[PDB]
Write an enzyme that holds these catalytic residues in place. Structure first.
Site, mmCIF file in Angstrom:
data_model
loop_
_atom_site.group_PDB
_atom_site.id
_atom_site.type_symbol
_atom_site.label_atom_id
_atom_site.label_comp_id
_atom_site.label_asym_id
_atom_site.label_seq_id
_atom_site.Cartn_x
_atom_site.Cartn_y
_atom_site.Cartn_z
ATOM 1 N N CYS A 246 40.763 -63.917 93.755
ATOM 2 C CA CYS A 246 41.241 -62.546 93.893
ATOM 3 C C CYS A 246 40.278 -61.522 93.307
ATOM 4 O O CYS A 246 40.087 -60.444 93.882
ATOM 5 C CB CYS A 246 42.627 -62.415 93.265
ATOM 6 S SG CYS A 246 43.919 -63.129 94.318
ATOM 7 N N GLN A 247 39.698 -61.825 92.148
ATOM 8 C CA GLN A 247 38.853 -60.872 91.456
ATOM 9 C C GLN A 247 37.645 -60.543 92.337
ATOM 10 O O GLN A 247 37.037 -61.461 92.890
ATOM 11 C CB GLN A 247 38.407 -61.431 90.104
ATOM 12 C CG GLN A 247 37.649 -60.436 89.225
ATOM 13 C CD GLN A 247 37.407 -60.960 87.820
ATOM 14 O OE1 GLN A 247 37.767 -62.089 87.493
ATOM 15 N NE2 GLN A 247 36.800 -60.135 86.978
ATOM 16 N N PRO B 71 31.148 -73.659 93.713
ATOM 17 C CA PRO B 71 29.871 -73.007 93.372
ATOM 18 C C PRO B 71 29.903 -72.136 92.123
ATOM 19 O O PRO B 71 28.867 -72.000 91.460
ATOM 20 C CB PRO B 71 29.568 -72.175 94.624
ATOM 21 C CG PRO B 71 30.909 -71.839 95.166
ATOM 22 C CD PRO B 71 31.816 -72.998 94.847
ATOM 23 N N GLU C 287 39.815 -67.169 84.390
ATOM 24 C CA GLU C 287 40.728 -67.014 83.265
ATOM 25 C C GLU C 287 42.193 -66.997 83.688
ATOM 26 O O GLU C 287 43.053 -66.658 82.869
ATOM 27 C CB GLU C 287 40.395 -65.742 82.475
ATOM 28 C CG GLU C 287 40.484 -64.449 83.263
ATOM 29 C CD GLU C 287 39.139 -64.005 83.797
ATOM 30 O OE1 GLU C 287 38.594 -63.006 83.282
ATOM 31 O OE2 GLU C 287 38.620 -64.665 84.721
ATOM 32 N N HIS D 193 35.724 -69.371 76.394
ATOM 33 C CA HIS D 193 35.730 -68.057 77.030
ATOM 34 C C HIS D 193 37.098 -67.760 77.632
ATOM 35 O O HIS D 193 37.783 -66.814 77.223
ATOM 36 C CB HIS D 193 34.644 -67.976 78.104
ATOM 37 C CG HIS D 193 34.578 -66.646 78.795
ATOM 38 N ND1 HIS D 193 34.136 -65.502 78.166
ATOM 39 C CD2 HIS D 193 34.902 -66.278 80.059
ATOM 40 C CE1 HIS D 193 34.190 -64.487 79.013
ATOM 41 N NE2 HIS D 193 34.651 -64.931 80.168
ATOM 42 N N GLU D 194 37.545 -68.605 78.565
ATOM 43 C CA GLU D 194 38.781 -68.307 79.282
ATOM 44 C C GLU D 194 39.963 -68.278 78.327
ATOM 45 O O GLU D 194 40.875 -67.454 78.476
ATOM 46 C CB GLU D 194 39.005 -69.326 80.396
ATOM 47 C CG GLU D 194 38.079 -69.146 81.594
ATOM 48 C CD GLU D 194 36.675 -69.657 81.337
ATOM 49 O OE1 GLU D 194 36.452 -70.283 80.278
ATOM 50 O OE2 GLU D 194 35.797 -69.437 82.197
ATOM 51 N N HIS E 199 40.446 -64.978 76.938
ATOM 52 C CA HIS E 199 40.975 -64.014 77.897
ATOM 53 C C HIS E 199 42.478 -63.850 77.727
ATOM 54 O O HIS E 199 43.009 -62.743 77.880
ATOM 55 C CB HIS E 199 40.636 -64.433 79.328
ATOM 56 C CG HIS E 199 39.350 -63.857 79.835
ATOM 57 N ND1 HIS E 199 39.197 -62.516 80.118
ATOM 58 C CD2 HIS E 199 38.158 -64.438 80.110
ATOM 59 C CE1 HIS E 199 37.967 -62.296 80.542
ATOM 60 N NE2 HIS E 199 37.315 -63.444 80.548
ATOM 61 N N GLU F 297 35.820 -57.993 79.511
ATOM 62 C CA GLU F 297 34.973 -59.114 79.118
ATOM 63 C C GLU F 297 34.415 -58.931 77.711
ATOM 64 O O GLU F 297 34.399 -59.883 76.919
ATOM 65 C CB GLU F 297 33.846 -59.302 80.135
ATOM 66 C CG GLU F 297 34.319 -59.836 81.492
ATOM 67 C CD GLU F 297 34.903 -61.246 81.418
ATOM 68 O OE1 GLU F 297 34.860 -61.865 80.332
ATOM 69 O OE2 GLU F 297 35.404 -61.741 82.451
ATOM 70 N N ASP G 230 31.852 -56.526 93.827
ATOM 71 C CA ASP G 230 31.210 -57.832 93.736
ATOM 72 C C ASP G 230 29.700 -57.769 93.934
ATOM 73 O O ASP G 230 29.014 -58.747 93.623
ATOM 74 C CB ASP G 230 31.829 -58.791 94.760
ATOM 75 C CG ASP G 230 33.223 -59.246 94.363
ATOM 76 O OD1 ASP G 230 33.338 -60.282 93.674
ATOM 77 O OD2 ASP G 230 34.204 -58.566 94.733
ATOM 78 N N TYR H 164 29.385 -57.949 80.072
ATOM 79 C CA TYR H 164 29.648 -58.994 79.082
ATOM 80 C C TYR H 164 28.849 -58.743 77.806
ATOM 81 O O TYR H 164 29.412 -58.438 76.748
ATOM 82 C CB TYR H 164 29.298 -60.372 79.660
ATOM 83 C CG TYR H 164 30.180 -60.850 80.791
ATOM 84 C CD1 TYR H 164 31.164 -61.804 80.570
ATOM 85 C CD2 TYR H 164 30.017 -60.365 82.083
ATOM 86 C CE1 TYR H 164 31.967 -62.255 81.599
ATOM 87 C CE2 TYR H 164 30.820 -60.808 83.120
ATOM 88 C CZ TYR H 164 31.793 -61.754 82.872
ATOM 89 O OH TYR H 164 32.594 -62.202 83.895
HETATM 90 ZN ZN ZN Z 1 35.498 -63.461 81.417
#
Ligand code: ZN
EC number: 3.3.2.6
Length: 606
Positions: free
Chosen positions: A132-133, A263, A268, A292-293, A296, A315, A372, A380
C-alpha cells in the site's frame, strides 16, 4: 492539505472505520467485494464527499439500503481517479454515516503483487501480497488515501480452501465459506486506528510456528522452520521496546517471511511484520535488523506524518528508537557504529542525488511528484541525524528518550506536521530554549545537502574495520603471507560487513590478494547475505573465475534487488562470465519477481 490525495480532506469529513468483505480470485487476479466506510462529517450541510480510486471498477454505492449516485473523475497520472459520492441527506456536524461501495480491483493494480507458483517456494500454489505504501491503498478499495486519516477496520476474506489469508490485524475466526464449500473465510479485527496505507493482505500457502507468547512466525513449509530459529529472540527485543517506550499496545506481533522472490525490504505493517528472506543467515546475526519494524509500533505507526512531505517524522524517530534497541543488545558504541553507518548512507544518497536536489531536504514538497519516485534514505538518516544532534545538544540519551516518550504519549493515534513536532519540542525542553534557539532550523528542515553540523560518533568499532581494510588495500605480495586467521578475533559480523564494504569501495584487488583472503578468512563458508554479497562482488570485480558459480547461485537464490541487481551487473561487466550470466538470466527469469526480471533484463540488454 495533502497534495497526493484527491479525496475530501480530514477538515470536511473523516473515515472512522472500514468493514471489508472480499474474495480472492487467482485466475482473474482480482479482489471483488464491498468496502463499508463509516464517515463522520466535521461540518454542517455536507451533501457529498470524494474518495480515491485507482483502476477500480465500481458496481454500486449503497447508503442506508438504497443505491446513491456517484461519478468517477478523470485519472491524473499516479494520483488516480477521484470518486464523487452524492449523499442522500445533508449531514450535520459529527453526524455519522455508513457508505458501502461494491468494488473490484484491476489485475494490473499497483497495490497487489500476484506471484505465480513458480515464483514461490513450494512451486505448487500461487501467492499474493499487498504493498500500500505510499498512496497505493486507493488501488485496492475506495477510501480517503492519506496518512492524515486514521481508522480501525474489520475484514472478512474468502480464499481457496487450501490457502490462508493474513492481514495487519488480530486474527479472529476461520470458517468454511457458507456459499462456496471449496473456499474459506478468514476474519480480522484491527482495534487501533491506523492510516489506510498500513492495511496489508497476504494470501498463500502458509504455516506457523509459535516463537513467543504473542509471536507467531508465518511462511511456506520450506522457510518456516528456519525463520522460527533465526527469529526466536524477537520476544526479548519486544521487551526491550517496551522498556524504552512503554507497553505494546497492538496486542499481537507476528512475522511473515515472504518467498525468496521478494525484491524489497521489510514492512512495518501492524500486528504482522513482513520480513525479507535475506535475513536468514543461520546464525541469527541479521535478526537485529527486525528491530526497525518493531520500533515502528512504538514510533511512527502511533504518531503518523500528516502528509508525505512530513515522512521524516515517521522514519526518523523510528530509526532513533531502533538504534537504541540495538544499543542495549550490543552496547552503546555499537549504537554509535550503526549511527556512523547511517550517516554514511546519507552521504551516498546526497552525492547520488546531488547536494542541490530538492529530495535531499528533510521536509520535501511532493506536490506534482510521485511519492515512490522521490523515496530515498534522506528522511531516514537525515531525520535521525537531527534527533541525534539534538540528543547531544540537549544533555543526553536519557533526557531525549524522556522527550521521545512524551512525544508518543501526546500524539499517539494521531497525525502531525513538522511544525507540530517543533512546537512540542520547544514546549517540552522549555527550560533549555537558549540551546534550542542556536539550532539552525531553516537549514536542517528546508535546506538540501548534508546537514550543517555533524554529530559526534564513537569511532572504535569502525576504526578496527578501517585498520584491517587499509592493511589489505596497502598490502604487497611480500605482505600477503603475514596475514593470519586471527585478524577476525575481535570483530562482529557487522564489523566484517563494514570491512568488506570499505575494502570493496577501492576497486579491483590483485587476484592473489583475494585468493589469500579466502585462504585465511574462509569467507566462502559464511552464508550471511550481506557479507557474502560484498565478498562475492569483491571476487568478481577482481577477476576471479572460481567465484562465477557462487556469484551466480546467490543472484538467483534470492530475489532482493539490492543483491540480485548488482550481482548481475558485475557478472555482466566481467567479460569472462558475461555470456553465462545472460543465459542464466534467461533460465531463471520465469521464477523471478516480475519487476526484478525486466529490470535485470534491461541491465543485461535483452
Ligand atoms: Zn521504516
Amino acid at each position: 492539505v495533502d497534495t497526493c490525495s484527491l479525496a475530501s480532506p480530514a477538515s470536511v469529513c473523516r473515515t472512522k472505520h472500514l468493514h471489508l468483505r472480499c474474495s480472492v480470485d487467482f485466475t482473474r487476479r482480482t479482489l471483488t467485494g464491498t468496502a463499508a466506510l463509516t464517515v463522520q462529517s466535521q461540518e454542517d450541510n455536507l451533501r457529498s464527499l470524494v474518495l480515491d480510486t485507482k483502476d477500480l471498477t465500481i458496481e454500486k454505492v449503497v447508503i442506508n439500503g438504497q443505491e446513491v449516485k456517484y461519478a468517477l473523475g478523470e485519472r491524473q497520472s499516479y494520483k488516480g481517479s477521484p470518486m464523487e459520492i452524492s449523499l442522500p441527506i445533508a449531514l450535520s456536524k459529527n453526524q455519522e454515516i455508513v457508505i458501502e461501495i461494491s468494488f473490484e480491483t484491476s489485475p494490473k493494480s499497483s497495490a497487489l503483487q500476484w506471484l505465480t507458483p513458480e515464483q514461490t517456494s513450494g512451486k505448487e500454489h500461487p501467492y499474493l501480497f499487498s504493498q500500500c505504501q505510499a498512496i497505493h491503498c486507493r488501488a485496492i478499495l475506495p477510501c480517503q488515501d492519506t496518512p492524515s486519516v486514521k481508522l480501525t477496520y474489520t475484514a472478512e476474506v474468502s480464499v481457496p480452501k487450501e490457502l490462508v489469508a493474513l492481514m495487519s490485524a488480530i486474527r479472529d475466526g476461520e470458517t468454511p465459506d457458507p456459499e462456496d464449500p471449496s473456499r474459506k473465510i478468514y476474519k480480522f479485527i484491527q482495534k487501533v486506528p491506523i492510516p489506510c496505507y498500513l492495511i496489508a493482505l497476504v494470501v498463500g500457502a502458509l504455516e506457523s510456528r509459535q516463537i513467543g507468547p504473542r509471536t507467531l512466525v508465518w511462511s511456506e513449509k520450506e522457510q518456516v522452520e528456519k525463520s522460527a530459529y533465526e527469529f526466536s529472540e524477537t520476544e526479548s527485543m519486544l521487551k526491550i521496546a517496551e522498556d524504552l517506550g512503554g507497553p505494546y499496545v497492538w496486542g499481537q506481533y507476528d512475522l511473515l517471511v515472504l518467498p525468496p522472490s521478494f525484491p524489497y525490504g521489510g514492512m512495518e505493517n501492524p500486528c504482522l511484520t513482513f520480513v525479507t528472506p535475506t535475513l536468514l543467515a543461520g546464525d541469527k546475526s541479521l535478526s537485529n535488523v527486525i528491530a526497525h519494524e518493531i520500533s515502528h509500533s512504538w514510533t511512527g505507526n502511533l504518531v503518523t506524518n500528516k502528509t508525505w512531505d512530513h515522512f521524516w517524522l515517521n522514519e526518523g524517530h523510528t530509526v532513533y528508537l531502533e538504534r537504541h534497541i540495538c544499543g542495549r543488545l550490543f552496547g552503546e558504541k555499537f549504537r554509535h557504529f550503526n549511527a556512523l553507518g547511517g550517516w554514511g548512507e546519507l552521504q551516498n544518497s546526497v552525492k547520488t542525488f546531488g547536494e542541490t536536489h530538492p529530495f535531499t531536504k528533510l521536509v520535501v514538497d511532493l506536490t506534482d511528484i510521485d511519492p515512490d519516485v522521490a523515496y530515498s534514505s534522506v528522511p531516514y538518516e537525515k531525520g535521525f541525524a537531527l534527533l541525534f544532534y539534538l540528543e547531544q545538544l540537549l544533555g543526553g540519551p536519557e533526557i531525549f528518550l524522556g522527550f521521545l516518550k512524551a512525544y508518543v504519549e501526546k500524539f499517539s493515534y494521531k497525525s502531525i506536521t513538522t511544525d507540530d513536532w517543533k512546537d512540542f519540542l520547544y514546549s517540552y525542553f522549555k527550560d533549555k530554549v537558549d540551546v534550542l534557539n542556536q539550532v539552525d532550523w531553516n537549514a536542517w528542515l528546508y535546506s538540501p545537502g548534508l546537514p550543517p553540523i555533524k554529530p559526534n560518533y564513537d569511532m572504535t568499532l569502525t576504526n578496527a574495520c578501517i585498520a584491517l581494510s587499509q592493511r589489505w588495500i596497502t598490502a604487497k605480495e611480500d605482505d600477503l603471507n603475514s596475514f593470519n586467521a586471527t585478524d577476525l578475533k575481535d570483530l562482529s559480523s557487522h564489523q566484517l560487513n563494514e570491512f568488506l564494504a570499505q575494502t570493496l569501495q577501492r576497486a579491483p584487488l590483485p587476484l592473489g590478494h583475494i585468493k589469500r583472503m579466502q585462504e585465511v578468512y574462509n569467507f566462502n563458508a559464511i552464508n550471511n547475505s550481506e557479507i557474502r554479497f560484498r565478498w562475492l562482488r569483491l571476487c568478481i570485480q577482481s577477476k576471479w573465475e572460481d567465484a562465477i558459480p557462487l556469484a551466480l547461485k546467490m543472484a538467483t537464490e534470492q530475489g532482493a534487488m539490492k543483491f540480485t541487481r548488482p550481482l548481475f551487473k558485475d557478472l555482466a561487466a566481467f567479460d569472462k562470465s558475461h555470456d553465462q550470466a545472460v543465459r542464466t538470466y534467461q533460465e531463471h527469469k520465469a521464477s523471478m519477481h516480475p519487476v526484478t526480471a525486466m529490470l535485470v533484463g534491461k541491465d543485461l540488454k535483452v
